Amino acid sequence: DTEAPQVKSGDYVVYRGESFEYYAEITDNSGQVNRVVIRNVEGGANSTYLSPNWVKYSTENLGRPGNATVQNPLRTRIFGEVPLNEIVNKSYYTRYIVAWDPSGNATQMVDNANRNGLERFVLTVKSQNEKYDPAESSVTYVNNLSNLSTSEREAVAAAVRAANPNIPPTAKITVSQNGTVTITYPDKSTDTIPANRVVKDLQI
Ligand SMILES: CC(=O)N[C@@H]1[C@@H](O)[C@H](O[C@@H]2O[C@H](CO)[C@H](O)[C@H](O[C@]3(C(=O)O)C[C@H](O)[C@@H](NC(C)=O)[C@H]([C@H](O)[C@H](O)CO)O3)[C@H]2O)[C@@H](CO)O[C@H]1O
Ligand code: NA
Ligand code: NA
Ligand code: NA
């Protein structure tokens, strides 16, 4: 056996202030995989260094016959919690999944984007706003679109909240005097909703 384990990963996008969890699938022609490391490219054959330190991983059922077949691949959990203080611009971390078969053949690390989604993957860190796609709210009819009262601003925010149960509970929804909506996430990134997607009046 001189064929290394083959890996299928994916496009692993993660977001500040949020947990993430992805699975990679690993097969070997022998049907068995004994070890899995996720690592930075540098450091040579024995390195297990992986950064950022909040990237965790685990593999169940290692070292058992038939644990890594085409019909039932071995799976490695890749998971963690992204801190609020990560720098984003998106930020990118290209990483490698190395698996070993019983003969000691290890998946090779090849530095080319054409291998992305195989043993090589890109972990993309985005701001928290990018995880959400604020939904179409129920229109709030106000007296005058150029001057919402406090009660009208609160009504618009409540309609947006009711239409968006998946946004973080501690995100803050605010509405301006012309009905423009701002959603401020825990990581302090924002989404905006133009007024005429949420408010109308009967002045015409
Ligand atoms: C084999 C070896 O030791 N050579 C290293 C050389 O590999 C290393 O280059 C790194 O190569 C990897 C792919 O193998 C990436 O291309 C690294 O580029 C990026 C990345 O995608 O990982 C770009 C990205 O924009 C960077 N992110 C941020 C937030 O800055 C990351 C990031 O700096 C690193 O991932 C942190 O570990 O790097 C590329 O750097 C170079 C430089 O380390 O050194 C050779 O000797
Ligand atoms: Na093999
Ligand atoms: Na499986
Ligand atoms: Na968004």
- Say which DSSP state 106 is in: B
Q: Is 53 in the pocket of ligand 1 (CB under 6 A)?
A: no
Q: Is 47 in the pocket of ligand 1 (CB under 6 A)?
A: no
Q: Structure solved using which method?
A: X-ray
Long-range contacts of 192-199 (CB under 8 A, 24+ apart): 193/134, 193/137, 193/160, 195/145, 197/136, 197/137, 198/137, 198/139, 198/140, 198/156, 198/159, 198/160, 199/139, 199/140, 199/141, 199/142, 199/145, 199/148, 199/152, 199/156
> What tokens does 20 get?
């993430």
CB 39 within 8 A of CB 49: yes
- 106: CA distance to ligand 2 center in Å? 8
Neighbours of 45 (CB within 10 A): 7
Which atom of ligand 1 is the closest one to the Cα of 125? 29
Q: Is 79 in the pocket of ligand 1 (CB under 6 A)?
A: no
* In the chain, domain spans: 1-133, 134-204
Tell me which ligand sits closest to the C-alpha of residue 30: 2
